[model samples]
Target chain A: AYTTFSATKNDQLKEPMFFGQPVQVARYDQQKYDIFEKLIEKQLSFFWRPEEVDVSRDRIDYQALPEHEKHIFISNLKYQTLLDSIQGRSPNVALLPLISIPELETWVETWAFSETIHSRSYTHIIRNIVNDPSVVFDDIVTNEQIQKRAEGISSYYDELIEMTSYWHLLGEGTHTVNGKTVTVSLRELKKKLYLCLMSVNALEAIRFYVSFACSFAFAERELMEGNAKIIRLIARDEALHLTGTQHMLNLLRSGADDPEMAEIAEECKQECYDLFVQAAQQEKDWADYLFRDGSMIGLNKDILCQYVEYITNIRMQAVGLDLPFNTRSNPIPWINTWLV
Target chain B: AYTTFSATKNDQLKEPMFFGQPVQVARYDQQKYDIFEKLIEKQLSFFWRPEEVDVSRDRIDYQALPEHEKHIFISNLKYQTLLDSIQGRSPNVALLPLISIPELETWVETWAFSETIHSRSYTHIIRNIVNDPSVVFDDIVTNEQIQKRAEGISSYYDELIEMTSYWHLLGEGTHTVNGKTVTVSLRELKKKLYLCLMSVNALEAIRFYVSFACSFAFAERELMEGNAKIIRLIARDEALHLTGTQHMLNLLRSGADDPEMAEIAEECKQECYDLFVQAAQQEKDWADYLFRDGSMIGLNKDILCQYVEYITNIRMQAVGLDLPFNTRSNPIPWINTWLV
Candidate 1:
């Protein structure tokens, strides 16, 4: 059921986005929807390497920073690395096997690859500033602050990968594995994918951008500009990635690609809402941690929290989810210049 | 056993390439193998968009061709598309879950993403040369000649992916399901990975180069040069990919990366020899199908068969496998010009 090359002479355009025949011909001459092919072209055109930016000056700037300021910058970089680390592999692992169309399948792979470059860039930034790079890299897995966020994010993907194995292997039935009942449901699987997409949208669309604000904040003061240069390029790539997930979520919700997925999206609306709220709460809690020691120059806990609410509302409405946070103006309009 | 981000704080440089802890951090400030990081940099620098190539003239050139030459040309394009269709997705699907080190993990993703660009470029070539790219694209899966080669090539990836799902799910052990016995073996999985890498090496090394000669012969005639321009880029990328696998295979056998893989390579040596022989013979049989009616200038079944034997020897010897055929000089020296 999960063969890499399924031998079917099926029409790719007629197939749904998922749970249809696996893509046989990797043709991009035409698509069921042209936007994914467009996304792939745009992403490839945006191809980059992290090493081109010289971060030599970041070492000097970091050594001169206040102790709490160093904590603020390094923690933000660590969080960015965690997001990319999950993103760089999860799409390919969880989504590659499920995608039904060539345009969408290849887009997932390309999107993941770009995230790996982001991961590499984090190391570039960390090594230049830190005495021992392992101190930062190791804390991502064991630090209670990072590990809490990690559990919320990876649980969605882990569940999907597990259910997907059962679906791909035993395939949509009640079965006995070890004297207990195990039912693999296609409907449940589609729901998992939809929720997973929402989670990913929250990641690329919400979580990553918050981390970027911190990176840009450091550069806004004319310090750590080298790290800022690398992250600016990363932010550009992430813009394409978030847009991809948005299209997938909208397409499914509109019953355009897979009607079953649309129903699944509807049925899972409350869970989806709760998921977004949970992510926002996690992010707010993280903001408190970042400012725990002391506040930075322009971005304190309150300002960043306000920006989180503002952005979260806009993103939720974009995907037709009701906003849990109140709509408000961007708290840090000055950061826009650095985003460019 | 297959956590997305391992929590251990062990040094990554001490880990094996596979069957170690999954990479906890996505750092590239250092690498256990510097060559992969170098390869990633080289691949990033070589990125190009397919739409940049002008394939408009290819339609006119294709229209003026004789029937058999058109057969030779269209058949070659379809084969190229089929090969990319598998290469684009197979690497991430079969390899990502098992990668242990960050540099190699990212390298695998980057390599596959580049291949998707190759897949997209094929569509750009296919749509320009024919009014209906679907007619040509649709035939690959059903065409007996193409399907035969696809079967042989996809089996190795398919096997590795299937065993991998079990390995990730149940770990290395024996189990029971529905009153039946089930067993999962880590060493057996490593053997599958080794054989699969050898098969991929043959596909990129031998199968693609044969098709390249056919493509460049058209370019040599000053016709369909736009399509050839795209193939040249793809050829350059494939060279990097083949080199990556060759390094992995050589490193495994040298007991430099994974000592267990060294044993696995030895145990599977004869089987790997037969695998390459079968792939080379399949390429020759494919030559028979491509030139069933007539052969194009500067290329024919006999010449392609000789070239197959020629490349099969060099590539097999690169990974320490015995040559499957007698050593012979390249049949077409003119191909050297187009390759660059």
Candidate 2:
């Protein structure tokens, strides 16, 4: 039972962490996490309509591509369709119910809502790039590579959701159902939540970065600049998302909000490290599959793998993970130019 | 597992609604329901920011009011806070987990996300209207009249959420827990969802409209016109919300989406009617509370009660509920003048 304002509130909500203290009021005059407010402002400023980006040239470009390049383009799109599909629904579905602060809760919804727009942008892009959009969208599920990644991402969310539903419905205790004894504890649920956030961080930080490279790789060869522009806007939004996940992870590690969570963070440090490695490895495999038939001009299996390692290290360090990769510099510095 | 795209090859989603069909691909080129798409476009066009409305004049109008009149103004603002607070979180928390269609799911998130913006607007209004906004916001949860309404609104959402968690976490089955037998059934959950949506419809259609009348009444006297402008924007958005709920009810009643929902809708009709009447009666009680000390020049208890009956009938009829109020003509027709 969250209220619009808590009249008896006398604590500094900033001192408590994410899900602490019911937000007294939705006041932005002061903020504990200015990053969220900044993200909201950035997202609002980056407000765009899918109609604004004309993918007309992409229709011809796509048609002109050989069979292999068409496979690359369409598969890359299918992968993006899957990525945004999870993103469009996952944040609000998973995070909103647990949030106690108004600004961060609204930020989560706002962030997820913006992803829905990105999801719509994909439909717009696909509609323009293909004569039969259904053929492209339908193949997304049938495609083996896309399906594999979808399962990995969705499994993490499903586990967290299942645990959360139990925790919220029946508080921590051992309960018997259908002659089976099941124990539910907040600690277990928090671990699931922690891993879920880590999974989300990997999704946003790694999977999205890999897809951006593919999109920008097309633009680097002087093809599909319109699609690249939309991807750039998406990248800007993803930067905010990555920042949010980093904050969540760091806050938990620092024991700022829940002291028990800090202990769980320490206990799960190795598991978190493994999750990042697994995601990076899966992405490298996806890269291999993307360029199996042929490689685009500026990107290939080797360069993309390098990009994956580079991103994994940077993202891991951002969340206080020990850097596992020895990558010295961004293999594709040109991507940063567009990012800035 | 829900994916950006499902990869079961030819497997179709034939399970019960809500928890089933993890929206595979987001293609708006087609839709299970076009109303959601239309609502999305309408909501997007109605995009607004609180900063756009100049509320500087409201500072002076608020200060010049007599004690009781000031109470009316601030209390109304507090009520608006409570309404938007529940609205901002309820739809996403309650409905998103159950939605099957892609466009409808995204529209639900987008609609709820916009309400958060409305919630934020109230904070902005309050901060500008008084030296210390917390005094007014703080009273919202503690005020007896407002708290009574809060319980009604929150209970509907809470019940829906509890049942939804049960159905989603533990599938339909007979289970014993703590020496008690509990039967979880999809039919029962669907019925709860139907009644919940109806309750929400009444809140948006009837309760919000009553609050709008109060906000606009201030502007009718050439006072608080800035707040009125913001309320008008909110009213425009609420028009779309009412349309969304009305369409959902009509569609469910017609068995367009799910046949069982039609049965549930029929069974819940009387209950929904009673919910609306209860809400209207509560609002009338609130009017009495608002005017206890003294009446304003153009508004008072009797007039507000009349407006409640007048608005209640229109809202009830919109969703196929039998009209329970006989007040055909608005007592304070001058309030309509402020609509311009």
Candidate 3:
């Protein structure tokens, strides 16, 4: 059911986005929808290395910061690393097996690969600033604050992967496992996959932009400009990634790619809204943690929370969901200068 | 056994190559094995787009080829596409879950991402030569000659992925399923992974070099120079990929990365030798098919088969296996110029 190469000759343009024939030939000569191929090209054209951006001056900038500011900067960086660490591999592990079309399959791979570069940039920035990177890297797992977010981020992927494995091995049917009845439903699996994509969309679309605001806030104050330079490039790549997932969600909901997915998307509407709202709430909680000591000159918990709400509203609308929070103007308009 | 982002904080440097704690932090500030990090850096530096290589002249050159020459060229191109179509996604799907160290994890993602670039190159080559890229892309799965190779290449990955799913879900033990007992041995799974890596190395080191020889032969006659330029780039990257796998195999067998792997490598020595020999034989059989219509000037079945034996010996010996063929000098020395 899940061979790496499905040995079948079929019209790739006619396949669904997922749960169809596994992609045999990685052809991009044509696509059912061209957005994925366009995203792959744009991502390739945006290819970059983190080391190209010098983070040398960040050491001095970091040491000069007060204790609260240090906590603010380092905490935000750790959360960013956690998001990327999951994103760097989850999309391929969880989605590649189920993807049907070639263009989207390659786009998922391309999107994940860019996140690895973002992971590398974190290492670059951290190594430049801190004497012992382990003190920072190790705490990514142990830190209660960051681990809270890690659970939310990875649980959806972990569940999706587990169900995908069962579906691939046992297939769709009822089975007895050690005297217990187990059911692997394709419909249930598709629902899980749809919800997973929405969660991922919230991640790249909202979770990432929140961190970007923190990174740019430092440069807005003429500090840690090297780190800011690296992050700006990351933001540009992420803009494309968010777009990739948004298109997947939108197309699935439109009943164009797979009518079954549209129905699942409809049935899971409230759950999807809750997922995004929960993600936003988690970021707001994270904001409280980041600024617990003291507020930064250009950014603080209240303003950051507002930005989260504003972005969440926009991202939700992009996927055809009603706004979860009251709409407002851009909370941090200056962040756009760095995003583009 | 497998979580996308392992939450427990542990020292990544002390972890084994596989079946240890899943890599939690995507930190490159340090590595247990620097070779993987080095490979990732080298791969990032080698990134190039297929569109950058203009294939407009290739359309004219392909039109002028003799019927037999066209068969030789197009069949070889299809084989190349089949290989990349698998390589592009298999490494990330099969390897990412089991990998423990951070450097190797990212290296696997980086390696697979580069293969996607090669896959895109095939589309670039095929669409330019034929008005309907489908004529070439469609044959990749349906053509009997290429499907034979596809099965052999994908079997190792599929088996390893299945075993990994069981290990992750059921953990290490004998379990009763329905009415039968199924045993999932970690050691046996590790052996599968080792053989999979060996098969991959042969694919890149021996199989790809064979295709490159065919591709370069056309350019040697000042025909299809644009396609030759792209293959040269692909060859350079494959050289690095083969080196990465060679180092992994050598390290595992050296009783350094994991003593269990060294024992497993010792136990499966003969099977690995047979895998490489089988791959070489398949390529030889493929040569007969490619040249069945007629042989081109620079390369024929006898010379390509000799070159297979020539490269097979070098590759097998690289991972400390006994050479399966008679010793011989390089049959095609001109390939050295294009390879570097």
lDDT of 2 at A132: 79
Give the whole-model CA lDDT for all candidates, comma-separated: 0.86, 0.79, 0.90
What TM-score, computed on C-alpha atoms, does each candidate reach? 0.97, 0.95, 0.98
Better of 1 and 2 by TM-score: 1
Candidate 1 chain A, poorest ten consecutive residues by summed lDDT: A331-340
Q: Rank the candidates by lDDT, best first.
A: 3, 1, 2
Give per-residue CA lDDT, model 2, range B1-340, as digits (tens). Answer: 2233345543223333354565767678777677889999889877888877888988998898899999888888888888887788778878888877777888898899889889878977988988876677667656777887655666667777777777665678887865778888888888888888888888888888888888887888889988988888888899899889998888888875687888888878778888888988888888777887888878888888888899889888877778897758877777676542
DockQ winner between candidates 1 and 3: 3
Q: What is the docking quality class of candidate 1?
A: medium
Q: If ranked by DockQ, best first, what sequence of candidates would result?
A: 3, 1, 2
The collision pairs in model 2 are none
lDDT of 3 at B133: 87
DockQ of 3: 0.84
Candidate 1 has which clashing residue pairs, if any?
Answer: none
